[PDB]
Amino acid sequence: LQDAEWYWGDISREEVNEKLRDTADGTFLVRDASTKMHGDYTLTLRKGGNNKLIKIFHRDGKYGFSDPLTFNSVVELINHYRNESLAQYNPKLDVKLLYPVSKY
């Protein structure tokens, strides 16, 4: 994760939103979590118009999203979901975030 793509580099609702205010029906990027000085960031996705916020569970430098904090990498995780689909979050259904946003 030297820079990642979906993630721009931590920003704010102004940027995130301004970009997710007019996009496909399922976007996803990162939101700077400067409200703890101890956490990493916050995943945010556009659900057709309602930006859904999601917190990231970090500890010392790794990441928590599915496993007991061990993969220590988002690119590794997000990758496994980018090609598949987050069907573990909300049961009875599934979501697919194959529409990231950036400036690459």
Q: Which sequence spans correspond to the domains of the chain?
A: 1-104
Method used to obtain the model: NMR
Q: How do the residues of the chain divide into helix, strand and coil, expressed in percent and rounded to 5? A: 15, 20, 60
Q: Of the candidates 34, 4, 3, 14, which has an alpha carbon nearest to the alpha carbon of residue 100?
A: 4
Q: What is the DSSP letter of 95?
A: B
Beta-strand relationship, 41-46 and 51-55: antiparallel
Q: Which residues contact 62 (CB under 8 A, 6 or more apart)?
A: 69, 70, 71, 72, 73
Specify the CATH number of the domain 1-104.
Answer: 3.30.505.10
Q: Of the candidates 30, 13, 27, which has an alpha carbon nearest to the alpha carbon of residue 74?
A: 30
Place of tokens 């599934």: 94
CB 46 within 8 A of CB 23: yes
